[PDB]
Every structure is written in structure tokens, then in C-alpha cells.
Design an enzyme around this catalytic site. Structure first.
Site, PDB file in Angstrom:
ATOM      1  N   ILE A 286       0.826  -1.204   0.000  1.00  8.95           N
ATOM      2  CA  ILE A 286       0.000   0.000   0.000  1.00  8.95           C
ATOM      3  C   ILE A 286       0.863   1.258   0.000  1.00  8.95           C
ATOM      4  O   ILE A 286       0.840   2.045  -0.948  1.00  8.95           O
ATOM      5  CB  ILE A 286      -0.878   0.102   1.227  1.00  8.95           C
ATOM      6  CG1 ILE A 286      -1.701  -1.174   1.427  1.00  8.95           C
ATOM      7  CG2 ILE A 286      -1.750   1.316   1.066  1.00  8.95           C
ATOM      8  CD1 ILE A 286      -2.014  -1.458   2.906  1.00  8.95           C
ATOM      9  N   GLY A 287       1.609   1.449   1.082  1.00 10.42           N
ATOM     10  CA  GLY A 287       2.480   2.601   1.189  1.00 10.42           C
ATOM     11  C   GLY A 287       3.932   2.163   1.169  1.00 10.42           C
ATOM     12  O   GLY A 287       4.801   2.852   0.624  1.00 10.42           O
TER      13      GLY A 287
ATOM     14  N   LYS B  24       7.333   1.643   4.300  1.00  7.97           N
ATOM     15  CA  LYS B  24       6.349   1.137   3.338  1.00  7.97           C
ATOM     16  C   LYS B  24       5.365   0.158   3.987  1.00  7.97           C
ATOM     17  O   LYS B  24       5.768  -0.841   4.591  1.00  7.97           O
ATOM     18  CB  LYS B  24       7.069   0.498   2.148  1.00  7.97           C
ATOM     19  CG  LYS B  24       7.933   1.511   1.408  1.00  7.97           C
ATOM     20  CD  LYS B  24       8.617   0.935   0.181  1.00  7.97           C
ATOM     21  CE  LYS B  24       9.418   2.023  -0.531  1.00  7.97           C
ATOM     22  NZ  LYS B  24      10.157   1.541  -1.732  1.00  7.97           N
ATOM     23  N   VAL B  25       4.075   0.481   3.858  1.00 15.57           N
ATOM     24  CA  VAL B  25       2.978  -0.298   4.437  1.00 15.57           C
ATOM     25  C   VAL B  25       2.395  -1.404   3.572  1.00 15.57           C
ATOM     26  O   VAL B  25       2.017  -1.182   2.421  1.00 15.57           O
ATOM     27  CB  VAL B  25       1.802   0.595   4.809  1.00 15.57           C
ATOM     28  CG1 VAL B  25       0.745  -0.234   5.536  1.00 15.57           C
ATOM     29  CG2 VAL B  25       2.289   1.758   5.646  1.00 15.57           C
TER      30      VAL B  25
ATOM     31  N   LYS C  69       4.059  -2.456   8.694  1.00 20.20           N
ATOM     32  CA  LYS C  69       4.934  -1.382   8.271  1.00 20.20           C
ATOM     33  C   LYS C  69       6.355  -1.820   8.580  1.00 20.20           C
ATOM     34  O   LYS C  69       6.671  -2.179   9.715  1.00 20.20           O
ATOM     35  CB  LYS C  69       4.616  -0.083   9.022  1.00 20.20           C
ATOM     36  CG  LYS C  69       5.495   1.087   8.603  1.00 20.20           C
ATOM     37  CD  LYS C  69       5.199   2.330   9.416  1.00 20.20           C
ATOM     38  CE  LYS C  69       3.801   2.843   9.157  1.00 20.20           C
ATOM     39  NZ  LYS C  69       3.513   4.076   9.951  1.00 20.20           N
TER      40      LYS C  69
ATOM     41  N   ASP D 215       2.052  15.214  10.588  1.00 18.75           N
ATOM     42  CA  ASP D 215       1.594  15.122   9.208  1.00 18.75           C
ATOM     43  C   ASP D 215       0.126  14.677   9.067  1.00 18.75           C
ATOM     44  O   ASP D 215      -0.194  13.735   8.332  1.00 18.75           O
ATOM     45  CB  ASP D 215       2.519  14.169   8.439  1.00 18.75           C
ATOM     46  CG  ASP D 215       2.520  14.436   6.943  1.00 18.75           C
ATOM     47  OD1 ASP D 215       1.841  15.398   6.498  1.00 18.75           O
ATOM     48  OD2 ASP D 215       3.208  13.684   6.219  1.00 18.75           O
TER      49      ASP D 215
END
Ligand SMILES: CC(C)c1n[nH]cc1-c1ccnc(NC2CCN(C)CC2)n1
Length: 252
Positions: free
Chosen positions: A8-9, A11-12, A28, A113
């Protein structure tokens, strides 16, 4: 004990908690570090309802295992049927947002954030903050753009910005850089007045050139909602409302 199903992210990833019924989780992979993880674990013991659950922390780079939520605020706002989000759903999600924020702030943790992509929305419609404790400038507080202060009011400026975005369903301040961002902001709230300008930054109040009706940019905002939105979007961090007192604003 975990099978990465999709990225996903750090990094996720989206994995399956093999030891726990194959439920979905978000892995993560990522001294100060040790301390930051200790805080995360510590915050987890309070299992706040508006903060993503930290199911476990594995070593070997470190992998954090969080509960997995199917969607974020962005996706939620993309899918909502016009005219948009129900006024009472905004009010509620905002309260849940302020709730998790005040939790983090009471414990002296600044998100830093806060943006729609890391404000997750649960199956049941519950708000859960994520990605904290360890680029778009559309949610950066003035003081951060100016590189002045970095206290917790920073997160409230972000809240005002998200709050506006629940009505607009479009970002309020879409700058392209630090200076552009700070520029687009002042066009709306207007020049702060020398008195409220940081005395150590590189950007002078003079580098910009008056306030205008907020309802122009956020249509359908109440009188209370407007009061709260402005208290969040106050140029001076010191004069900006806190999550704690925001939870008590008449709006709610
Ligand atoms: C911001 C995200 C990458 C993220 N960063 N850090 C933790 C998460 C996290 C934790 C738990 N669930 C989800 N769910 C989904 C929510 C929807 N987006 C699109 C993917 C992750 N994300």
C-alpha cells in the site's frame, strides 16, 4: 505469522494475521527509534478508540503490525453521493478526530503530518488516526512552513484544513511549495500583522501582500462550525485553539 497480500504505502503492506484467523493487518517495515516505538507501545495500552490498534511489533529493520482499516478519509470523500457528507456526519467525524488528537496531545505526541490519507475510516464509520510517532504541504501549519515553531498547535491547523475539506471535498490550500503554500493561505485568512509573525524565520511578513469571508470557500458551514474552523486556522500558534477546548466548542 504474516503473509503480505499487497503493498500500500516506511512502506505499508496488507497481510494476513495467520495466528489470528487470517484477519487483515497492516505491516509497516521501518536510540530515538527505540524510544519512539516505546511511546507507540505505551499509547497502545490505552487502546483509544480513535487511534489505530498496534497489534504487535516485530524485530528481525522493524515491522509494526496494526489493525487494517479498508479505507481513509480521501476514499470516503471520493465515494460520498452528492451533495456530499451529511452535516451531522461531518460533526461526528470531526469530534472523533479531535478526540484522538487530544489523546495524543495529552500525552505530548504531535502527529506532525495530519492529512486525509492517514485518517482512516472504519467499517462502522469510526475515525482512527494513523501514521504518527515515527509530499503535500496543503495541511502544513504556517509556523511549519516558515520553519519557526513545531508544537502541537501544528496539528490543529491541519484539522481546520481537513474540516474545511469535508464540506468542499476539495483541499482548501493547494500550494506547490513552502512559499506558494504560505501564499495561498494568507490570501484567505489575510496578513497576520507584524505582532503575530515569527521573529527568526527567513520569510518576512513583507514578502506577502487581506482577509476574506470563509463561507466563500466553505459553503454550508454553520455559524458555530465557522467559529471553530477559524479558531483552528488562526495564524498564531499561541492563539490557535487546542483539541481539548475544541472538543468543548458549541459546534459539538
Ligand atoms: C496511511 C497508511 C498507508 C498507513 N500508514 N501507516 C499505517 C497505515 C495503516 C494502518 C492501518 N490501516 C491502514 N489502512 C489502509 C487505509 C486506506 N489506505 C489507502 C491504505 C491503508 N493503513
Amino acid at each position: 505469522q504474516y503473509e503480505c497480500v499487497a503493498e500500500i504505502g516506511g512502506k505499508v503492506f496488507k497481510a494476513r494475521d495467520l495466528k489470528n484467523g487470517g484477519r487483515f493487518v497492516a505491516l509497516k517495515r521501518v536510540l530515538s527509534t527505540i524510544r519512539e516505538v516505546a511511546v507507540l507501545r505505551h499509547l497502545e495500552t490505552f487502546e483509544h478508540p480513535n487511534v489505530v490498534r498496534l497489534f504487535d511489533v516485530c524485530t528481525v529493520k522493524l515491522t509494526l503490525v496494526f489493525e487494517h482499516v479498508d479505507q481513509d478519509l480521501t476514499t470516503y470523500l471520493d465515494k460520498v453521493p452528492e451533495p456530499g457528507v451529511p452535516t451531522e456526519t461531518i460533526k461526528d467525524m470531526m469530534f472523533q478526530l479531535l478526540r484522538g488528537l487530544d489523546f495524543l496531545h495529552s500525552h505530548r505526541v504531535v502527529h506532525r503530518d495530519l492529512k486525509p490519507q492517514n485518517i482512516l475510516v472504519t467499517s462502522s464509520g469510526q475515525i482512527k488516526l494513523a501514521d504518527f510517532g515515527l509530499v503535500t504541504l496543503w495541511y502544513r501549519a504556517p509556523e511549519v512552513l516558515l520553519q519557526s515553531s513545531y508544537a502541537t498547535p501544528v496539528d490543529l491547523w491541519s484539522v481546520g484544513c481537513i474540516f474545511a475539506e469535508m464540506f468542499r471535498r476539495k483541499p482548501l490550500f493547494r500550494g506547490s511549495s513552502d512559499v506558494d503554500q504560505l501564499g495561498k493561505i494568507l490570501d484567505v485568512i489575510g496578513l497576520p500583522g507584524e505582532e503575530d509573525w515569527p521573529r527568526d524565520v527567513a520569510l518576512p511578513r513583507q514578502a506577502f501582500h487581506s482577509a476574506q469571508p470563509i463561507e466563500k470557500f466553505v459553503t454550508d458551514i454553520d455559524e458555530l462550525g465557522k467559529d471553530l474552523l477559524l479558531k483552528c486556522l488562526t495564524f498564531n500558534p499561541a492563539k490557535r485553539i487546542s483539541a481539548y477546548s475544541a472538543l468543548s466548542h458549541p459546534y459539538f
